[PDB]
Amino acid sequence: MESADLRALAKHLYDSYIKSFPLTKAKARAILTGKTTDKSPFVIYDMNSLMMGEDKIKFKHITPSKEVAIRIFQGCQFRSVEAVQEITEYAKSIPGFVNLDLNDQVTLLKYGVHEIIYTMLASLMNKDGVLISEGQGFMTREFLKSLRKPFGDFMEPKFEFAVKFNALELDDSDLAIFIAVIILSGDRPGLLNVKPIEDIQDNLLQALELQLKLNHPESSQLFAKLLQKMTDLRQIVTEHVQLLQVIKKTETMSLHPLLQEIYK
Amino acid sequence: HMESADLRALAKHLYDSYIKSFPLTKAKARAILTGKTTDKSPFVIYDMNSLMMGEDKIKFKHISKEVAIRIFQGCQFRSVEAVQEITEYAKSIPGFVNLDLNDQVTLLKYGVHEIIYTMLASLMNKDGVLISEGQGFMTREFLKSLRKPFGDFMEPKFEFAVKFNALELDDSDLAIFIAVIILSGDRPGLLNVKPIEDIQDNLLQALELQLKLNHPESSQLFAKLLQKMTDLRQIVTEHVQLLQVIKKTETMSLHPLLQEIYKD
Numbered sequence: 001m002e003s004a005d006l007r008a009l010a011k012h013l014y015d016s017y018i019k020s021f022p023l024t025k026a027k028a029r030a031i032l033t034g035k036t037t038d039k040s041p042f043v044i045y046d047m048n049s050l051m052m053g054e055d056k057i058k059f060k061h062i063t064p065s066k067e068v069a070i071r072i073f074q075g076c077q078f079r080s081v082e083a084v085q086e087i088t089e090y091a092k093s094i095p096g097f098v099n100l101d102l103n104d105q106v107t108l109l110k111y112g113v114h115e116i117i118y119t120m121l122a123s124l125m126n127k128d129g130v131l132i133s134e135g136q137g138f139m140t141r142e143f144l145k146s147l148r149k150p151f152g153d154f155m156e157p158k159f160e161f162a163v164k165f166n167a168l169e170l171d172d173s174d175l176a177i178f179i180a181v182i183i184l185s186g187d188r189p190g191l192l193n194v195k196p197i198e199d200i201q202d203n204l205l206q207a208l209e210l211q212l213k214l215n216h217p218e219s220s221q222l223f224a225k226l227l228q229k230m231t232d233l234r235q236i237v238t239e240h241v242q243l244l245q246v247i248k249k250t251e252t253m254s255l256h257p258l259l260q261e262i263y264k
Numbered sequence: 265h266m267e268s269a270d271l272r273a274l275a276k277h278l279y280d281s282y283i284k285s286f287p288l289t290k291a292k293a294r295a296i297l298t299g300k301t302t303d304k305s306p307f308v309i310y311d312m313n314s315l316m317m318g319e320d321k322i323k324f325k326h327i328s329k330e331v332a333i334r335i336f337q338g339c340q341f342r343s344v345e346a347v348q349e350i351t352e353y354a355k356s357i358p359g360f361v362n363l364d365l366n367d368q369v370t371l372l373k374y375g376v377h378e379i380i381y382t383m384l385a386s387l388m389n390k391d392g393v394l395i396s397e398g399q400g401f402m403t404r405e406f407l408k409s410l411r412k413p414f415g416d417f418m419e420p421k422f423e424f425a426v427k428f429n430a431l432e433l434d435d436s437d438l439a440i441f442i443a444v445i446i447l448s449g450d451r452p453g454l455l456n457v458k459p460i461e462d463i464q465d466n467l468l469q470a471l472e473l474q475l476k477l478n479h480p481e482s483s484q485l486f487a488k489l490l491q492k493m494t495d496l497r498q499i500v501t502e503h504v505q506l507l508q509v510i511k512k513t514e515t516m517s518l519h520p521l522l523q524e525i526y527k528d
């Protein structure tokens with residue numbers, strides 16, 4: 001493709017990225033750094049401030065169970081279900097995606113949303129915590145990591161990944177292409193027609209390659225390093241699923257079957 | 265960043281070292297597998313009878329035992345030879361022997377297995393694998409049908425090789441790819457990540473140039489090749505988890521070299 005074509009693809013995905021997701025990376029950076037002297041976020045650092053925070057921000061996943069670590073865990077689910085729809089709608093704007101076989105569209109989203117949620121979560125994290133509720137709350141890493149039994153071990157790898165991933169210093173225009181590449185992976189099991197998916201992903205890769213050289217001209221092999229990250233993501237997604245397994249085996253949680261179906 | 269003539273020079277140096285370190289190249293393996301030549305023709309092992317003949321015809325460097333064990337011990341003896349050859353090749357990678365000595369050990373520890381699988385693909389097609397420096401050929405069917413846990417042990421190698429070989433890399437490409445794997449600054453416990461990444465950055469530049477010149481019509485071969493370093497990460501873990509099972513069922517001896525590598 002000609003370079004103006006790639007530049008157009010990049011700006012199309014960036015524009016669509018901005019409209020699809022509730023809090024961009026640029027905004028989240030302004031919050032985490034204190035740069036905006038605007039309203040400081042409500043900080044959740046312990047049990048009492050989690051109580052006060054629910055009552056203040058009036059969270060939408062409230063009145064679920066009772067144990068605090070569980071409540072937090074299930075609010076991670078609530079946000080993930082939301083994220084899934086946000087990525088699904090973003091997908092529709094990747095050139096060519098809607099023209100794929102409907103089953104292949106569903107297969108790509110199904111196996112990809114986990115990796116994308118991990119990635120975008122890093123935009124909302126620093127070494128000390130994570131923005132929640134469109135940047136209005138900030139929940140500390142230490143309070144998450146110190147949750148009881150397995151829940152503490154479940155939250156901390158997200159921060160461990162995010163800190164490493166954020167060292168790349170990608171911005172939203174970088175991430176919008178990167179997200180698209182993940183979605184268009186032709187190696188997802190059960191794809192009926194791999195060829196047009198790789199054809200799209202090749203245009204996306206070309207666009208990401210050129211976007212990274214223009215936007216990070218002094219970051220050698222940033223393209224390569226970012227693809228290596230896409231390696232890890234596969235691994236962390238697998239570790240993650242084997243960790244949701246133990247909780248359902250050991251703790252076994254909610255009862256409302258309808259609720260469980262939404263989170264199926 | 266380097267000048268192109270310096271990148272071409274590093275590719276030539278690496279290809280020359282690979283030829284000196286690895287006696288059975290992909291080019292020689294492909295000539296044996298394609299045939300159309302009388303002198304290079306392998307004896308084929310597809311069942312117990314041909315295995316028995318096989319040991320009377322081709323010179324196995326691997327001496328009353330049950331057959332799957334006997335084949336297992338054949339691979340591990342050959343894996344140890346491969347570690348030896350890979351170690352010698354690593355030392356030729358510029359900058360490698362100047363790294364901290366425990367980093368050298370750590371990079372080999374986590375890198376040899378990924379390299380063995382990569383170079384095993386050169387010896388394979390969909391129907392089986394070359395053995396004993398190309399003097400023999402053992403069918404995939406025969407390995408797949410071995411008993412207990414040993415049949416399902418041999419088979420994931422073949423599944424990776426068929427996918428990897430679709431890239432159609434030759435030895436000059438593989439020589440630089442093998443090096444990129446070794447100089448991975450993300451291995452657990454590395455003490456000086458930075459000088460390792462500076463070497464890999466150079467190796468990645470060399471691979472990028474090499475793949476564009478040698479495969480000028482292969483869109484995003486670079487990106488696709490880097491995405492294979494993913495699967496590799498997962499088949500290595502699947503391998504060591506299978507080796508874990510066999511230990512608890514078999515008493516099969518592990519070479520001291522391999523015994524130390526498997527250890528965390």
Ligand SMILES: O=C(O)c1ccc(-c2nn(C(=O)c3c(Cl)cccc3C(F)(F)F)c3ccc(Cl)cc23)c(OCCc2ccccc2)c1
Nearest residue numbers: 072075076077079080083114117118121130132144155158
């Ligand atoms: O806003 C956002 O874009 C956002 C996207 C994600 C999380 C998140 N997901 N998650 C997961 O385990 C997870 C992952 Cl990664 C991927 C797929 C599925 C799941 C899940 F859940 F289903 F298992 C986390 C684990 C730890 C942490 Cl710290 C965060 C997450 C997110 O956390 C906000 C959580 C929260 C808690 C209390 C109140 C309000 C919000 C925000």
Ligand SMILES: O=C(O)c1ccc(-c2nn(C(=O)c3c(Cl)cccc3C(F)(F)F)c3ccc(Cl)cc23)c(OCCc2ccccc2)c1
Nearest residue numbers: 326335338339340342343346380384393395396417418421
């Ligand atoms: O020539 C070569 O470069 C070559 C490199 C590797 C194998 C190989 N290793 N291997 C392993 O299990 C293995 C791995 Cl990958 C890595 C570390 C440790 C081990 C092990 F053993 F300790 F557990 C295999 C499993 C299945 C298959 Cl098909 C091949 C391998 C290789 O096998 C064929 C050679 C052979 C020699 C004598 C008798 C029978 C076969 C050749």
